[PDB]
């Protein structure tokens, strides 16, 4: 009744990359599946439309030479792929039914950039200020690609006060903190630890945020 | 044809009734769609054809309009109610709302400033990054100003935004300034000043390169 | 008797 | 697009007795788009006062048309159709045989 | 046996000539039984069948108002269709839809139809599954892609499987004397000499309902479906329908020719050769 999007996949800027779309649950040759795209920037807008019975596809001016919609009946699969890639199409797609039912949306990430491990850096407050009650620390995990990194605290078991702000790109690398919010009488009194995880590039980082001076 | 969804975004209780209006350029008969969506989930259609309710979805929703006017209300706000709306026309072309956000009333809160040097070993790798969070905090808005000795500095700088705290209902940011060893080395005194709803001067947090 | 609602083309 | 020619028929309701009243048809089927032209002439003078039936159509989209009236027949009266079409060039003229 | 119910819809551009007009006639079997016509001095829905008079106020009201509002939508369907095929609005063009619902003895829904067509062809069907929509052009596929994407074929089926075949059950109950009585044609043979060497023999069939009939000449039991004119089934203007069919034959071959008739209201085949 629900269909599956493909895996979340990244390119070069000027490739090409091709999406897939596998529907169920419905006559799947005889309505027509419908592109979206979602960028954080902008919105939901339209890409395509296509219907598999004899594949006849409908496109955006603003998409006309940079998507192309196809589609295989044996399959159930509708496919779309996108040419010269830039840095604008770096966005989340959706395939849908008529509008009847979404998919969980293909992720694409344009940029030229390598397999790069992070670096882990400790954040501790100003020549170790731990006077005033509840202190505040953090992990800086800067430079790595691609993504995601995990990040946890002692090993996973600090866990309240604990925020991660979402990844931010500073050109072609990814930037992430992350913050921890405990009492003075804990700090620097227990051992306060961030751990980090690049499973794409295999790396594992064990940091220990102290007090200096 | 363009809609325009309003309001752009907003705050509301658990049990408040919310309404959001969509309105075309022109007569889009009934041709109106209204979608959710809800941070890594699969879209979700909530009404289609401007006034059907989808089977399943929670009868507090409701679809209505007419012409170029439609609306998409919510009788009892639930807390799994929070998250992006869109509005969809299908008579002419295919084109969306701007999106509505619908996110958590709570009492206004003040942030908590927090302001870090470089790391040694990141000095040692040629790089600064001098970082500042700004904690659990009420409403979203708020502003925030780099001051090197002094002078106001945009260059070089890192902005990441959280989104409401699922606890308490908050907002954290985090703003990095990335310099290089020498760059920051030829400086002293890093505020991070912060601009907020709840006051009216900014909350300065500052430290020495001493 | 006759379908009252009709669909704009 | 798509222009096809008219089927013209002419005919009476009951077969055609001298002296008593009958009803003159003319069945125009087949035919699009729907402008057409039908008049019921008796010894060459149009006669007046002719209803016919409302614009329905077939399987293959083609519309039909039945324009009656009252008449009564004689043995020396000449009596036609005669329609004009957009598929036609001159109007075309269909006797009517009381055998027929 | 099954019965079945249409309505015809008819929109005509004139540019020039006034607004659009708009006609709808509305058949249960071979029989009309409502008429509307948006070029009246009144225009109204109106009926023209004995048993649909017994009707109330309420039901000609609702038909006459979806007949005023078809009127202009229409009138903007065509405006619609023009810029869906960049045509020019001083054209003359045509949109036709017919649509309704088909019961067997058991007066339950068999198969409902929905077609429009432009310009004298297809334009968009509703298939048997009354769930999909089948577009002839790329440009009824975009009226095909907005019809899904607020599924109306919801709407087409529910009225399909609810009003259409209770308003169809109605009209048979209160017709029954009419529409579900079987009337056997007239049949006749009429010889015409044209040479002293062929004369034209003609079965005459008069004054039938449905329409839906067989007329063969056969020769001494071989059928001779090849020499024998033929004209197109003919309403005899009351209700009724007419058909002959003829054969040319020589001067004495009279009695071999027989004529084999095939109606619904014909309990046995009948066979005849005067």
């Known amino acids: 009744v629900q269909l599956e999007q493909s895996g979340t996949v990244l390119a070069r800027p000027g490739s090409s990359v091709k999406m897939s779309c596998k529907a169920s649950?419905?006559?799947?040759?005889?309505?027509?599946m419908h592109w979206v795209k979602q960028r954080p920037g902008q919105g939901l807008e339209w890409i395509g439309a296509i219907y598999p019975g004899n594949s006849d596809a409908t496109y955006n001016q603003k998409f006309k030479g940079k998507a192309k919609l196809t589609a295989v009946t044996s399959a159930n699969t509708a496919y779309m792929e996108l040419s010269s890639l830039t840095n604008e199409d770096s966005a989340v797609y959706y395939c849908?039914?008529?509008?009847?039912?979404w998919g969980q949306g293909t992720t694409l990430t344009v940029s030229s950039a390598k397999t790069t491990a992070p670096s882990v850096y400790p954040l501790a407050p100003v020549c170790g200020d731990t006077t005033g009650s509840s202190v505040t620390l953090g992990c800086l995990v800067k430079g790595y690609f691609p993504e995601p990194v995990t990040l946890t605290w002692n090993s996973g078991s600090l866990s309240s006060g604990v925020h991660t702000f979402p990844a931010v790109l500073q050109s072609d690398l990814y930037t992430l903190s992350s913050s921890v919010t405990v009492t003075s009488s804990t700090w620097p009194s227990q051992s306060i630890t961030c751990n980090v995880a690049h499973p794409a590039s295999s790396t594992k980082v064990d940091k220990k945020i102290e007090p200096a001076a | 044809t363009t809609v325009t969804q309003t309001p752009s975004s907003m705050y509301a209780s658990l049990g408040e009734r919310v309404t959001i209006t969509c309105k075309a350029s022109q007569d889009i008969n009934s041709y109106l769609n209204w979608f959710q969506l809800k941070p890594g989930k699969s879209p979700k259609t909530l009404i289609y054809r401007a006034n059907r309710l989808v089977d399943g979805v929670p009868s507090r929703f409701s679809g209505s309009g007419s012409g170029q006017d439609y609306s998409l209300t919510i009788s009892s706000l639930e807390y799994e109610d929070m998250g992006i709306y869109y509005c969809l026309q299908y008579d002419e072309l295919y084109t969306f709302g701007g999106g509505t956000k619908l996110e958590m009333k709570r009492a206004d809160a003040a942030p908590t400033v927090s302001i870090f040097p470089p790391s040694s070993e990141q000095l040692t790798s040629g790089g600064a990054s001098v970082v500042c969070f700004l904690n659990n905090f009420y409403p979203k808005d708020i502003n925030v100003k780099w001051k090197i000795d002094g002078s106001e500095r945009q260059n070089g700088v890192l902005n990441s935004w959280t989104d409401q705290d699922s606890k308490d209902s908050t907002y954290s940011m985090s703003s990095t300034l990335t310099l290089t060893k020498d760059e920051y080395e030829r400086h002293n005194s890093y505020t991070c000043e912060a601009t907020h709803k709840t006051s009216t001067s900014p909350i300065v947090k500052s430290f020495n390169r001493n | 008797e006759e379908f009252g609602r009709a669909f704009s083309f | 697009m798509i222009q096809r020619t008219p089927k013209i028929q002419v005919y009476s309701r009951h077969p055609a007795e001298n002296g008593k009243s009958n009803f003159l048809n003319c069945y125009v089927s087949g035919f699009h788009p729907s402008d057409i032209e039908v008049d019921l002439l008796k010894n060459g003078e149009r006669i007046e006062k002719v209803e016919h039936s409302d614009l329905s159509f077939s399987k293959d989209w083609s519309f039909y048309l039945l324009y009656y009236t009252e008449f009564t027949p004689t043995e020396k009266d000449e009596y036609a159709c005669r329609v004009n079409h957009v598929t036609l060039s001159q109007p075309k003229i269909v006797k009517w045989d009381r055998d027929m | 046996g099954s019965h079945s119910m249409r309505y015809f819809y008819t929109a005509m551009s004139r540019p020039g000539r006034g607004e659009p007009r708009f006609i709808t006639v509305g058949y249960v079997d071979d029989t009309l039984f409502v008429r509307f016509d948006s070029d009246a001095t009144s225009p109204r829905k109106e009926p023209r069948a004995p048993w649909i008079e017994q009707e109330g106020p309420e039901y000609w009201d609702r038909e006459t108002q979806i007949s005023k509002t078809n009127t202009q939508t229409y009138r903007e369907n065509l405006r619609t269709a023009l810029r869906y095929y960049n045509q020019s609005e001083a054209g003359s063009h045509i949109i036709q839809r017919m649509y309704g619902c088909d019961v067997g003895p058991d007066g339950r829904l068999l198969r409902g139809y929905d077609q429009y067509a432009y310009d004298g062809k297809d334009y968009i069907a509703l298939n048997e599954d009354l769930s999909s929509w089948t577009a002839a052009d790329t440009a009824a596929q975009i009226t095909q892609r907005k019809w899904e994407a607020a599924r109306v074929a919801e709407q087409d089926r529910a009225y399909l499987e609810g009003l259409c075949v209770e308003s169809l059950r109605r009209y048979l109950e209160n017709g029954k004397e009419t529409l579900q009585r079987a009337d056997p044609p007239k049949t006749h043979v009429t010889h015409h000499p044209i040479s002293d060497h062929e004369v034209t023999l003609r079965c005459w069939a008069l004054g039938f309902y449905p329409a839906e009939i067989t007329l063969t000449w056969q020769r001494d039991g071989e059928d001779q479906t090849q020499d024998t004119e033929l004209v197109e089934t003919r309403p005899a203007g009351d209700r009724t329908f007419q058909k002959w069919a003829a054969v040319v034959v020589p001067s004495g071959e009279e009695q071999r020719y027989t004529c084999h008739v095939q109606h619904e209201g014909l309990p046995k085949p009948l066979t005849l050769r005067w």
């Open positions: 649950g419905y006559s799947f040759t005889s309505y027509w």
């Open positions: 849908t039914n008529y509008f009847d039912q």
